[PDB]
Scaffold this active site. Structure first.
Site, mmCIF file in Angstrom:
data_model
loop_
_atom_site.group_PDB
_atom_site.id
_atom_site.type_symbol
_atom_site.label_atom_id
_atom_site.label_comp_id
_atom_site.label_asym_id
_atom_site.label_seq_id
_atom_site.Cartn_x
_atom_site.Cartn_y
_atom_site.Cartn_z
ATOM 1 N N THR A 37 1.307 -1.529 0.013
ATOM 2 C CA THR A 37 -0.054 -0.362 0.156
ATOM 3 C C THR A 37 0.795 1.256 -0.117
ATOM 4 O O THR A 37 1.652 1.736 0.987
ATOM 5 C CB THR A 37 -0.821 0.053 0.665
ATOM 6 O OG1 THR A 37 -1.904 -1.039 1.137
ATOM 7 C CG2 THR A 37 -1.129 1.377 0.938
ATOM 8 N N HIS A 191 -7.148 -11.140 0.445
ATOM 9 C CA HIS A 191 -6.005 -11.040 1.130
ATOM 10 C C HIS A 191 -7.071 -11.168 2.687
ATOM 11 O O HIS A 191 -7.853 -10.598 3.249
ATOM 12 C CB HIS A 191 -5.614 -9.334 1.102
ATOM 13 C CG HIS A 191 -5.218 -8.476 2.129
ATOM 14 N ND1 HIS A 191 -4.729 -10.031 3.884
ATOM 15 C CD2 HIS A 191 -4.482 -7.696 2.041
ATOM 16 C CE1 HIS A 191 -3.748 -8.566 4.208
ATOM 17 N NE2 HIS A 191 -3.943 -7.030 3.157
ATOM 18 N N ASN A 194 -3.331 -9.542 8.368
ATOM 19 C CA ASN A 194 -2.729 -8.525 8.852
ATOM 20 C C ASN A 194 -3.652 -7.763 9.615
ATOM 21 O O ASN A 194 -3.744 -6.632 9.344
ATOM 22 C CB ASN A 194 -2.035 -7.799 7.615
ATOM 23 C CG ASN A 194 -1.067 -8.131 7.201
ATOM 24 O OD1 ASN A 194 0.023 -8.774 7.903
ATOM 25 N ND2 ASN A 194 -0.644 -8.141 6.234
ATOM 26 N N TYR A 196 -7.488 -7.537 8.934
ATOM 27 C CA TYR A 196 -8.240 -7.717 8.348
ATOM 28 C C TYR A 196 -9.921 -7.623 8.209
ATOM 29 O O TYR A 196 -9.401 -9.798 8.562
ATOM 30 C CB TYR A 196 -7.536 -6.913 6.832
ATOM 31 C CG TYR A 196 -7.225 -5.403 6.280
ATOM 32 C CD1 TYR A 196 -7.067 -4.328 7.644
ATOM 33 C CD2 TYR A 196 -5.734 -5.972 6.638
ATOM 34 C CE1 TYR A 196 -6.409 -3.812 7.496
ATOM 35 C CE2 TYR A 196 -5.036 -5.178 6.888
ATOM 36 C CZ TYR A 196 -4.597 -3.568 6.785
ATOM 37 O OH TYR A 196 -3.474 -2.768 6.894
ATOM 38 N N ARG A 243 -3.878 -15.565 1.050
ATOM 39 C CA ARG A 243 -2.420 -14.841 2.496
ATOM 40 C C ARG A 243 -2.982 -15.063 2.869
ATOM 41 O O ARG A 243 -4.131 -14.602 3.395
ATOM 42 C CB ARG A 243 -2.111 -12.910 1.323
ATOM 43 C CG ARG A 243 -0.811 -13.136 1.564
ATOM 44 C CD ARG A 243 -0.349 -11.529 1.795
ATOM 45 N NE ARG A 243 0.874 -11.882 1.998
ATOM 46 C CZ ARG A 243 1.501 -10.349 2.198
ATOM 47 N NH1 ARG A 243 0.842 -9.479 3.369
ATOM 48 N NH2 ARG A 243 2.751 -10.221 2.189
ATOM 49 N N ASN A 251 -2.499 -5.240 13.453
ATOM 50 C CA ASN A 251 -4.285 -4.732 13.976
ATOM 51 C C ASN A 251 -4.318 -5.662 15.009
ATOM 52 O O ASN A 251 -6.009 -6.089 15.391
ATOM 53 C CB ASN A 251 -5.143 -5.066 12.623
ATOM 54 C CG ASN A 251 -4.483 -3.613 11.403
ATOM 55 O OD1 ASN A 251 -4.291 -2.321 12.405
ATOM 56 N ND2 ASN A 251 -4.187 -4.141 10.374
ATOM 57 N N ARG A 348 9.165 -4.522 1.352
ATOM 58 C CA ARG A 348 10.299 -2.595 2.099
ATOM 59 C C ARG A 348 11.338 -2.220 0.771
ATOM 60 O O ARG A 348 11.442 -1.950 0.196
ATOM 61 C CB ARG A 348 10.331 -2.738 2.943
ATOM 62 C CG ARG A 348 9.173 -2.407 3.634
ATOM 63 C CD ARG A 348 9.439 -2.669 5.286
ATOM 64 N NE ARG A 348 9.490 -3.584 5.974
ATOM 65 C CZ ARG A 348 10.281 -4.427 6.938
ATOM 66 N NH1 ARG A 348 9.736 -3.665 8.062
ATOM 67 N NH2 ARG A 348 9.740 -6.345 7.584
ATOM 68 N N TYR A 375 3.642 6.358 2.448
ATOM 69 C CA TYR A 375 2.263 6.655 1.888
ATOM 70 C C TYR A 375 2.431 8.535 1.858
ATOM 71 O O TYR A 375 1.265 8.827 1.904
ATOM 72 C CB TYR A 375 1.263 6.261 3.281
ATOM 73 C CG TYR A 375 2.364 5.151 3.986
ATOM 74 C CD1 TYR A 375 3.222 5.368 5.479
ATOM 75 C CD2 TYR A 375 1.321 3.988 3.465
ATOM 76 C CE1 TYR A 375 3.384 4.094 5.828
ATOM 77 C CE2 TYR A 375 2.102 3.036 4.134
ATOM 78 C CZ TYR A 375 2.806 2.864 5.176
ATOM 79 O OH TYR A 375 3.100 1.726 5.504
HETATM 80 C C1 LIG Z 1 4.509 0.733 3.137
HETATM 81 C C2 LIG Z 1 4.319 -0.358 3.757
HETATM 82 C C3 LIG Z 1 2.771 -1.197 2.656
HETATM 83 C C4 LIG Z 1 2.179 -2.273 2.817
HETATM 84 N N1 LIG Z 1 1.197 -2.714 2.243
HETATM 85 C C5 LIG Z 1 0.466 -3.943 1.512
HETATM 86 C C6 LIG Z 1 -0.613 -4.497 1.660
HETATM 87 O O1 LIG Z 1 -1.428 -3.508 0.759
HETATM 88 N N2 LIG Z 1 -0.789 -5.762 1.656
HETATM 89 C C7 LIG Z 1 -0.942 -6.518 2.284
HETATM 90 O O2 LIG Z 1 -1.087 -8.104 2.365
HETATM 91 N N3 LIG Z 1 0.733 -6.743 3.038
HETATM 92 C C8 LIG Z 1 1.766 -5.197 2.714
HETATM 93 N N4 LIG Z 1 2.461 -4.392 3.408
HETATM 94 C C9 LIG Z 1 3.182 -5.642 4.187
HETATM 95 C C10 LIG Z 1 3.843 -6.595 3.583
HETATM 96 O O3 LIG Z 1 2.810 -7.689 2.373
HETATM 97 C C11 LIG Z 1 4.966 -7.776 3.884
HETATM 98 O O4 LIG Z 1 4.453 -8.812 4.074
HETATM 99 C C12 LIG Z 1 5.839 -7.098 4.668
HETATM 100 O O5 LIG Z 1 6.519 -5.504 4.120
HETATM 101 C C13 LIG Z 1 7.335 -7.846 5.460
HETATM 102 O O6 LIG Z 1 8.523 -7.684 4.016
HETATM 103 P P1 LIG Z 1 9.841 -7.112 4.045
HETATM 104 O O7 LIG Z 1 10.528 -6.930 5.835
HETATM 105 O O8 LIG Z 1 10.331 -7.691 3.032
HETATM 106 O O9 LIG Z 1 8.655 -5.298 4.289
HETATM 107 C C14 LIG Z 1 3.053 -3.832 3.550
HETATM 108 C C15 LIG Z 1 4.293 -3.301 3.978
HETATM 109 C C16 LIG Z 1 4.666 -1.791 4.238
HETATM 110 C C17 LIG Z 1 5.937 -1.246 5.149
HETATM 111 O O1 LIG Z 2 1.224 -0.022 5.618
HETATM 112 C C1 LIG Z 2 -0.060 -0.523 4.949
HETATM 113 C C2 LIG Z 2 -0.929 -1.879 5.170
HETATM 114 C C3 LIG Z 2 -1.784 -2.149 4.919
HETATM 115 C C4 LIG Z 2 -2.065 -3.330 4.433
HETATM 116 C C5 LIG Z 2 -1.545 -4.476 5.391
HETATM 117 O O2 LIG Z 2 -1.948 -5.578 5.090
HETATM 118 C C6 LIG Z 2 -0.583 -4.073 5.797
HETATM 119 C C7 LIG Z 2 -0.129 -2.889 5.937
#
Ligand SMILES: Cc1cc2nc3c(=O)[nH]c(=O)nc-3n(C[C@H](O)[C@H](O)[C@H](O)COP(=O)(O)O)c2cc1C
Ligand SMILES: O=Cc1ccc(O)cc1
Ligand SMILES: [Mg+2]
Length: 399
Positions: A37, A191, A194, A196, A243, A251, A348, A375
């Protein structure tokens, strides 16, 4: 600046670079871009940003065969709650998504839309303004302090979904799946992680219902599985993915403190494999590693070493994507990919490294990311991260 104090290692000789088939897609490697996101979507309308989106997805789809999972996309207005997040329910959004999906396909990569529904994570006042409910599994347990705070201010109490309202969300999921696939998406990822909506039903802390949607492993999982069943029957099982984040606490989810969390998910995984034998095997299962129980804490914080996702492998036998702090730990990826059906998701660092796959294959320095523009409504921190070459020309390594 490049990530300092990090020994990069080339992963060209591992399975991270052996092709694999996920659904109808034939990936040329297993580094997957997980949903991220960014909040650049336009308001009003939850429209994919017209000025910058195509470029963003295009940058990260440069390495052919890459699998890209779009940022969270709202299936509808009620499933929404954030002004600047995209959606896939209107014609005005699908027109934008098509340009992205085409930009992506032209680079010879693949795209999967991630279907998003906020549940209690949505802003109650943002929902009150537009005349929408503040949904969730229950109504006597709130996410946290400021959420129950915003709930009252807007005179929008948290609503325990009724059977008919759940059926509606299932109808919007199908529609969204259908729009995405119609716009050229290769598939969609349900999804259910996390914290939701779906996760709120899955978790025993946020789900204190008494009907067939709460009260036991089998019931807390009903919603998720119905959605899965629904999307499988509408667009095909080879175009759907699920997922999960078994050990996540993001959350207000239970995490490993709940002794029945492994059983809760072992069950879901079991039902999938079940359908897999029935001929309908989902394209894949995406897991967030306990290495990251909160996506908001720096790499290394909030690690849960009291549990593992390995149990999924004894139940589900299809492709599995594992994501969470893998970019700064090539030593862990080299061991995890020795498994022939595992894919690695880099979140990330795919934000800051548009040419991440190349840097993984050649063991080059990684670009440090800027959390402040994660963001922001700007191109800065969104599409102005340089590739390795551009970084050398710009002198990011110090002469
Ligand atoms: C800025 C940001 C936005 C994210 N948006 C989403 C999202 O929209 N949907 C989701 O399922 N996970 C989202 N995540 C979680 C990531 O998919 C991932 O599980 C998490 O960043 C761990 O991986 P990393 O250590 O490689 O960043 C987001 C993480 C970050 C940091
Ligand atoms: O940071 C935004 C974000 C959105 C959806 C997720 O599932 C996890 C993080
Ligand atoms: Mg120079």
């Amino acid at each position: 600046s490049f990530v300092k104090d990090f020994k990069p290692q080339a992963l060209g000789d591992t399975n991270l670079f052996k092709p694999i088939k996920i659904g109808n897609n034939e990936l040329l490697h297993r580094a997957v871009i997980p949903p991220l996101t960014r909040m650049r979507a336009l308001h009003p309308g939850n429209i994919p940003n017209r000025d910058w989106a195509v470029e963003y997805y295009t940058q990260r789809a440069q390495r052919p065969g890459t699998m890209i999972i779009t940022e969270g996309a709202f299936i509808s207005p009620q499933a929404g709650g954030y002004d600047n997040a995209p959606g896939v329910w209107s014609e005005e959004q699908m027109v934008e998504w098509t340009k992205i999906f085409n930009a992506i396909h032209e680079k010879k990569s693949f795209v999967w839309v991630n279907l998003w529904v906020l549940g209690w994570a949505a802003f109650p006042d943002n929902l009150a303004r537009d005349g929408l409910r503040y949904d969730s599994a229950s109504d006597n347990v709130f996410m946290d302090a400021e959420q129950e705070a915003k709930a009252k201010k807007a005179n929008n109490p948290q609503h325990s979904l009724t059977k008919d309202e759940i059926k509606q969300y299932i109808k919007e999921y199908v529609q969204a799946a259908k729009n995405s696939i119609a716009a050229g998406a290769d598939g969609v990822e349900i999804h259910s992680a996390n914290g939701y909506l779906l996760n709120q039903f899955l978790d025993p802390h946020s789900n204190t219902r008494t009907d067939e949607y709460g009260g036991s492993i089998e019931n807390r999982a009903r919603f998720t599985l119905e959605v899965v069943d629904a999307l499988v029957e509408a667009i095909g099982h080879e175009k759907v993915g699920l997922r999960l984040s078994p050990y996540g606490v993001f959350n207000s989810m239970s995490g490993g403190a709940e002794t029945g969390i492994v059983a809760q998910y072992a069950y879901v995984a079991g039902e999938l494999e079940k359908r897999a034998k029935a001929g309908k095997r989902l394209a894949f299962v995406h897991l967030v590693e306990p290495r990251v129980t909160n996506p908001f804490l720096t790499e290394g914080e909030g690690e849960y070493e009291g549990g593992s996702n390995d149990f999924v492998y004894s139940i589900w036998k299809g492709p599995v994507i594992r994501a969470g702090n893998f970019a700064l730990h090539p030593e862990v990826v080299r061991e995890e990919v020795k498994d022939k059906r595992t894919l690695i998701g880099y979140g990330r660092f795919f934000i800051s490294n548009p040419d991440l796959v190349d840097r993984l294959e050649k063991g080059l320095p990684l670009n440090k990311y800027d959390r402040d523009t994660f963001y922001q409504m700007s191109a800065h921190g969104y599409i102005d991260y340089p590739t390795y070459e551009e970084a050398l020309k710009l002198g990011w390594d110090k002469k």
